[PDB]
Amino acid sequence: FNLDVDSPAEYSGPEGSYFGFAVDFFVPSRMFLLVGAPKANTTQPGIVEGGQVLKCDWSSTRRCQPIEFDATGNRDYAKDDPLEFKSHQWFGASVRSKQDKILACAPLYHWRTEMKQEREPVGTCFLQDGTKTVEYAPCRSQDIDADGQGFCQGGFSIDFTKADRVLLGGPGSFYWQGQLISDQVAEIVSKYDPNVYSIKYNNQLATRTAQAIFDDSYLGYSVAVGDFNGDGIDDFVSGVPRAARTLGMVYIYDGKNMSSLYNFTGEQMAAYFGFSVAATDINGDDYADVFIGAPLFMDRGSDGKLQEVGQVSVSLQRASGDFQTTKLNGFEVFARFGSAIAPLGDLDQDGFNDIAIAAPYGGEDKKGIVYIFNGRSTGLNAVPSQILEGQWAARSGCPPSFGYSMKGATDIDKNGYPDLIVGAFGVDRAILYRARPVITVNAGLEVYPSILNQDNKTCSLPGTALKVSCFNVRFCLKADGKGVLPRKLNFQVELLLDKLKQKGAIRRALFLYSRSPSHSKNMTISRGGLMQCEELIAYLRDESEFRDKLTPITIFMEYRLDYRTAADTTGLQPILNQFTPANISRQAHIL
Amino acid sequence: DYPVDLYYLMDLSASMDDDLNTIKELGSRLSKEMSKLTSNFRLGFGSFVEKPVSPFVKTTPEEIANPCSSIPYFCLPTFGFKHILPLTNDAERFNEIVKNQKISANIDTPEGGFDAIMQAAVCKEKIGWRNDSLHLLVFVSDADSHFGMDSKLAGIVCPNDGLCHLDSKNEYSMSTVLEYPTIGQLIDKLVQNNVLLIFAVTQEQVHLYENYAKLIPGATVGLLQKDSGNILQLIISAYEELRSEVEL
Ligand SMILES: *[C@@H]1O[C@H](CO)[C@@H](O[C@@H]2O[C@H](CO)[C@@H](O[C@@H]3O[C@H](CO[C@H]4O[C@H](CO[C@H]5O[C@H](CO)[C@@H](O)[C@H](O)[C@@H]5O)[C@@H](O)[C@H](O[C@H]5O[C@H](CO)[C@@H](O)[C@H](O)[C@@H]5O)[C@@H]4O)[C@@H](O)[C@H](O[C@H]4O[C@H](CO)[C@@H](O)[C@H](O)[C@@H]4O[C@H]4O[C@H](CO)[C@@H](O)[C@H](O)[C@@H]4O)[C@@H]3O)[C@H](O)[C@H]2NC(C)=O)[C@H](O)[C@H]1NC(C)=O
Ligand SMILES: *[C@@H]1O[C@H](CO)[C@@H](O[C@@H]2O[C@H](CO)[C@@H](O[C@@H]3O[C@H](CO[C@H]4O[C@H](CO)[C@@H](O)[C@H](O[C@H]5O[C@H](CO)[C@@H](O)[C@H](O)[C@@H]5O)[C@@H]4O)[C@@H](O)[C@H](O[C@H]4O[C@H](CO)[C@@H](O)[C@H](O)[C@@H]4O)[C@@H]3O)[C@H](O)[C@H]2NC(C)=O)[C@H](O)[C@H]1NC(C)=O
Ligand SMILES: *[C@@H]1O[C@H](CO)[C@@H](O[C@@H]2O[C@H](CO)[C@@H](O[C@@H]3O[C@H](CO)[C@@H](O)[C@H](O)[C@@H]3O)[C@H](O)[C@H]2NC(C)=O)[C@H](O)[C@H]1NC(C)=O
Ligand SMILES: *[C@@H]1O[C@H](CO)[C@@H](O[C@@H]2O[C@H](CO)[C@@H](O[C@@H]3O[C@H](CO)[C@@H](O)[C@H](O)[C@@H]3O)[C@H](O)[C@H]2NC(C)=O)[C@H](O)[C@H]1NC(C)=O
Ligand SMILES: *[C@@H]1O[C@H](CO)[C@@H](O[C@@H]2O[C@H](CO)[C@@H](O)[C@H](O)[C@H]2NC(C)=O)[C@H](O)[C@H]1NC(C)=O
Ligand SMILES: *[C@@H]1O[C@H](CO)[C@@H](O)[C@H](O)[C@H]1NC(C)=O
Ligand SMILES: *[C@@H]1O[C@H](CO)[C@@H](O)[C@H](O)[C@H]1NC(C)=O
Ligand SMILES: [Ca+2]
Ligand SMILES: [Ca+2]
Ligand SMILES: [Ca+2]
Ligand SMILES: [Ca+2]
Numbered sequence: 001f002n003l004d005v006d007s008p009a010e011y012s013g014p015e016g017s018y019f020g021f022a023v024d025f026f027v028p029s030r031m032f033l034l035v036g037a038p039k040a041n042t043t044q045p046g047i048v049e050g051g052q053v054l055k056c057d058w059s060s061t062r063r064c065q066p067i068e069f070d071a072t073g074n075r076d077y078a079k080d081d082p083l084e085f086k087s088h089q090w091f092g093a094s095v096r097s098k099q100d101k102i103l104a105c106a107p108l109y110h111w112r113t114e115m116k117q118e119r120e121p122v123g124t125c126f127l128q129d130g131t132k133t134v135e136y137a138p139c140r141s142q143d144i145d146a147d148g149q150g151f152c153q154g155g156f157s158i159d160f161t162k163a164d165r166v167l168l169g170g171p172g173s174f175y176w177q178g179q180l181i182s183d184q185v186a187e188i189v190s191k192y193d194p195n196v197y198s199i200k201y202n203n204q205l206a207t208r209t210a211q212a213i214f215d216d217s218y219l220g221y222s223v224a225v226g227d228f229n230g231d232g233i234d235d236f237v238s239g240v241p242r243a244a245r246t247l248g249m250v251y252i253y254d255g256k257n258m259s260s261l262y263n264f265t266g267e268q269m270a271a272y273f274g275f276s277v278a279a280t281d282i283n284g285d286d287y288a289d290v291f292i293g294a295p296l297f298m299d300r301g302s303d304g305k306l307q308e309v310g311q312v313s314v315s316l317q318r319a320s321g322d323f324q325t326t327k328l329n330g331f332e333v334f335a336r337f338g339s340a341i342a343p344l345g346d347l348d349q350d351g352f353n354d355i356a357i358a359a360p361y362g363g364e365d366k367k368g369i370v371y372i373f374n375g376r377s378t379g380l381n382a383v384p385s386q387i388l389e390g391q392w393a394a395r396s397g398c399p400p401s402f403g404y405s406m407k408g409a410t411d412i413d414k415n416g417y418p419d420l421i422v423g424a425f426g427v428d429r430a431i432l433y434r435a436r437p438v439i440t441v442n443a444g445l446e447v448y449p450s451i452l453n454q455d456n457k458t459c460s461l462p463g464t465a466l467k468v469s470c471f472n473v474r475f476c477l478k479a480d481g482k483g484v485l486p487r488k489l490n491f492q493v494e495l496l497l498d499k500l501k502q503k504g505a506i507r508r509a510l511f512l513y514s515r516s517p518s519h520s521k522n523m524t525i526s527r528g529g530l531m532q533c534e535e536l537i538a539y540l541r542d543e544s545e546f547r548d549k550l551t552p553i554t555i556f557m558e559y560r561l562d563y564r565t566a567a568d569t570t571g572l573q574p575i576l577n578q579f580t581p582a583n584i585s586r587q588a589h590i591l
Numbered sequence: 592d593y594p595v596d597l598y599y600l601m602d603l604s605a606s607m608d609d610d611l612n613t614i615k616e617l618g619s620r621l622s623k624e625m626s627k628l629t630s631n632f633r634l635g636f637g638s639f640v641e642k643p644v645s646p647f648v649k650t651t652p653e654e655i656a657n658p659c660s661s662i663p664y665f666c667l668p669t670f671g672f673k674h675i676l677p678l679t680n681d682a683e684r685f686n687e688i689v690k691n692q693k694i695s696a697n698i699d700t701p702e703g704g705f706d707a708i709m710q711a712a713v714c715k716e717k718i719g720w721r722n723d724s725l726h727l728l729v730f731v732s733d734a735d736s737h738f739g740m741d742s743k744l745a746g747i748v749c750p751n752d753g754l755c756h757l758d759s760k761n762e763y764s765m766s767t768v769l770e771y772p773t774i775g776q777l778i779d780k781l782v783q784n785n786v787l788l789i790f791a792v793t794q795e796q797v798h799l800y801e802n803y804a805k806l807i808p809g810a811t812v813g814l815l816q817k818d819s820g821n822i823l824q825l826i827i828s829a830y831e832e833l834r835s836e837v838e839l
């Protein structure tokens with residue numbers, strides 16, 4: 001709810017380059033945005049649309065710069081016998097970063113093989129650890145052709161573990177059974193040799209070829225990491241969207257020996273169960289939870305007829321090893337809710353991680369929607385607390401695809417709250433939404449005396465002779481926050497006397513100086529300090545003016561932050577928390 | 592008595608070569624049988640294989656020119672969807688067109704049938720659907736189908752728009768541009784164009800396509816023999832099946 005949608009940072013790249021197809025952060029110092037442009041023309045000799053990964057800075061006005069992973073053209077196997085084919089290789093289709101490590105891959109990279117003159121899409125990745133940049137193509141092996149790893153498309157999805165292992169998905173291995181490959185980042189860089197095209201890694205974890213019934217499964221279509229057997233080692237989660245006869249599945253493998261741990265199965269044909277997966281602890285128990293996207297799931301409408309809205313299943317990892325699974329349906333037909341699922345970290349710093357789910361083809365003009373969901377002790381809040389809308393219309397072949405890729409859990413402006421990058425490759429854009437800091441308010445309301453005797457006429461009304469039965473309304477205001485936030489918080493406080501009177505009943509309590517039931521007051525307070533209070537006198541109408549003496553007179557206090565004048569040095573205006581009612585009530589009684 | 596439109600949409604992979612040989616006179620034989628059941632029968636023809644892009648298709652110059660260099664045999668380069676014959680009353684025109692077709696690649700993977708089904712349902716003027724007639728779309732294949740974001744492997748990430756894309760040669764011109772349709776997109780277009788979809792598929796595909804048909808209104812599935820020896824009976828049975836919509 002606290003993402004600033006009024007003034008987000010808009011980064012753009014060359015048209016037609018699919019700038020924003022993959023997005024990530026970079027925290028080696030200063031921090032950066034990593035954007036993939038897989039259809040981008042580069043300076044590589046003879047390479048048409050090799051693709052690139054761009055490093056964009058937050059501090060400066062856009063100014064993105066391509067990261068030179070490889071400036072060379074196609075290596076030759078022999079004279080007039082090219083070894084590889086880098087044109088249209090889609091480099092930057094997946095970008096993944098961990099500290100000073102950057103992993104980018106080219107899933108449509110083809111090569112010749114070393115046995116004959118073929119053109120096989122084995123996929124390749126470039127890894128950049130600090131200074132040294134190495135290539136990583138675990139599917140570019142001697143196990144060639146579709147039966148082997150010839151069509152594996154390694155790097156179709158990638159991820160890092162917390163113990164410096166790469167997880168790579170190759171959906172085409174073994175006649176499109178798919179494959180997960182995991183290598184230690186140290187062995188990848190140490191054994192790299194630009195004259196060796198098939199490097200063997202000793203600590204490699206890889207799934208093996210299975211029976212022909214498992215062909216056409218697309219294991220490795222998407223990947224994610226998280227611990228699921230309680231041993232501290234991140235385990236491998238991967239969508240297998242064509243498995244179970246297009247019912248779709250999700251495989252979980254142990255991150256130590258590649259043994260199968262758990263399976264999930266879709267429940268509807270051709271819903272693409274497994275298109276996207278994510279793993280993050282959503283209910284604050286330190287057990288990572290599984291999010292499985294099925295963007296083509298069709299649910300029942302009001303008329304009983306199916307409608308394609310997409311579905312995300314939320315699986316809470318129980319301590320007993322089981323899973324408590326619920327399901328979250330999309331809101332718009334054909335919007336493909338669940339196409340991307342980005343863990344956001346704790347977007348509002350309330351102690352529970354949050355997640356974003358994109359419907360890249362929803363909203364007006366099919367400009368894309370991103371839904372923000374907050375976690376809590378019992379799990380994921382099914383109702384979204386914020387809706388991020390795409391602003392850029394489509395004048396291209398592809399729709400804007402706002403939300404098709406996104407990344408969270410990185411505090412890029414050091415304000416204490418994690419932020420979110422949202423890619424829109426159909427319009428060649430990536431957008432940074434910064435989290436606004438969250439104000440926790442402790443308001444007070446005292447009514448003394450709380451029992452009101454109508455015969456007790458103490459105060460007199462200003463300007464007349466008749467006294468009234470009066471009492472004091474004291475309201476206190478106190479605020480504080482956890483992140484980086486200004487001192488002066490400007491509050492607008494409203495008080496209404498006898499708000500909960502019957503429909504059409506007479507207003508029984510009025511303020512002394514105003515003869516009005518409502519009172520407004522502006523309060524500039526500084527956070528962390530003591531509570532700022534204000535006293536005021538209210539009175540009852542004469543006993544003959546109304547009959548309801550038994551209904552308690554509730555004093556209602558409403559307060560809102562001004563937002564206008566509290567902006568930070570970065571222009572980031574704070575916001576009140578959503579879980580707390582921004583009001584308080586206190587009642588008084590009559591004798 | 593009610594007019595009937597029939598569009599024969601055939602898998603043309605090399606495994607359908609013997610199927611082609613048996614259909615050589617299906618047009619005249621089918622319109623003879625339909626003559627008993629209706630006075631206005633019109634049949635047409637179209638064919639499909641797959642999106643002609645990597646990784647669904649080998650991409651060396653020679654393998655593109657001849658995707659059957661492994662048989663070794665001469666076959667046509669892989670193509671997405673060709674709309675050969677608009678539905679017509681001339682059953683002999685259906686015969687000679689069938690006898691002139693040639694099989695393409697020897698695919699043993701899922702195929703791009705859903706692309707053709709979408710084009711057949713949507714291209715009203717091109718296929719020739721009559722306004723007040725039963726629209727029967729016979730899908731003849733011995734393979735599973737690709738759908739939706741399967742084309743993401745090929746770098747095809749623009750969703751199907753459900754519009755007609757026949758490039759004057761009556762070939763699907765967005766085969767390499769747009770994604771395979773989703774089942775929800777097919778349902779949407781088949782219903783709007785009143786198209787009854789018949790899955791005439793071989794034994795290994797029957798149960799799979801049965802499940803697809805249970806999501807698609809008006810769809811039925813017939814167990815096709817390996818050489819399409821029973822396709823005539825399957826069409827009549829399916830027609831008489833759809834002709835009596837109990838629908839509880
Ligand atoms: C708590 O603090 C807030 C602010 O921090 C206080 O709000 C302010 O309250 C005063 C009243 O005390 C208002 O003055 C009155 O304004 C109305 C209409 O105001 C319009 O114009 C504003 C001009 O803003 C300019 O500047 C900004 C940039 O700063 C530009 O962007 C603009 O384009 C303008 O150029 C504008 O700010 C207002 O917008 C507000 O409201 C909209 C919703 O409508 C919001 O979305 C906005 O965010 C913004 O909050 C608004 O458009 C005038 O009509 C008033 O004139 C008469 O009425 C008074 C009584 O209301 C009276 O006292 C005056 O004397 C005056 O004339 C009268 O007196 C004559 C005697 O000389 C009589 O003969 C005559 O008959 C008549 O009766 C008045 O000028 C401020 O605009 C307002 N500002 C904001 C930002 O809210 C709030 O009051 C504080 N509350 C407490 C309890 O302390
Ligand atoms: C999640 O979901 C995944 C996917 O469904 C599950 O992974 C699958 O698990 C099953 C169960 O173990 C695997 O099936 C087994 O495969 C082995 C493979 O053996 C291989 O090597 C043998 C030599 O040691 C060789 O004989 C085998 O040859 C096979 O093929 C020939 C030719 O067709 C055939 O003639 C043989 O009979 C073999 O079938 C093979 O190359 C196999 O040995 C196992 O057989 C035992 O179990 C079956 C019942 O499962 C039983 O009928 C047999 O008699 C024998 O007792 C078994 O078939 C499958 O390979 C996995 N698929 C993958 C990894 O993609 C995973 O388990 C799920 N996890 C959870 C937690 O649920
Ligand atoms: C691959 O590695 C995983 C662990 O990373 C192995 O799982 C482990 O399996 C063993 C035996 O199946 C478990 O040992 C058990 O310990 C409990 C006490 O907790 C004891 O009561 C049992 O009798 C048994 O000895 C072990 O807990 C379990 N590890 C985890 C983290 O769950 C798996 O077996 C390995 N696979 C292969 C093929 O080596
Ligand atoms: C009749 O009404 C009057 C006014 O409403 C009542 O007088 C008020 O009595 C309260 C006691 O509950 C006083 O509050 C006290 O203030 C002192 C000093 O701050 C504080 O130390 C006490 O702890 C208490 O909070 C209040 O000041 C007083 N109001 C005025 C204007 O003097 C009176 O009690 C009513 N008569 C009754 C109930 O018989
Ligand atoms: C990258 O550059 C290539 C040319 O090097 C561009 O390809 C041209 O695209 C147009 C389409 O408008 C074709 O008519 C030309 O024939 C193409 N030329 C070649 C040599 O292939 C391509 O459009 C550029 N793409 C981006 C994203 O910049
Ligand atoms: C105070 O705000 C909450 C929102 O959290 C709302 O439910 C409640 O109705 C408000 N109080 C009154 C008296 O309207
Ligand atoms: C067919 O019917 C549709 C309405 O369903 C109408 O819009 C169209 O013009 C008709 N075409 C012909 C040729 O009758
Ligand atoms: Ca583990
Ligand atoms: Ca959890
Ligand atoms: Ca949170
Ligand atoms: Ca931040």
Ligand SMILES: [Ca+2]
Binds near residue numbers: 602605606607698734
């Ligand atoms: Ca076939």
Ligand SMILES: [Ca+2]
Binds near residue numbers: 607608609610733817
């Ligand atoms: Ca056959």
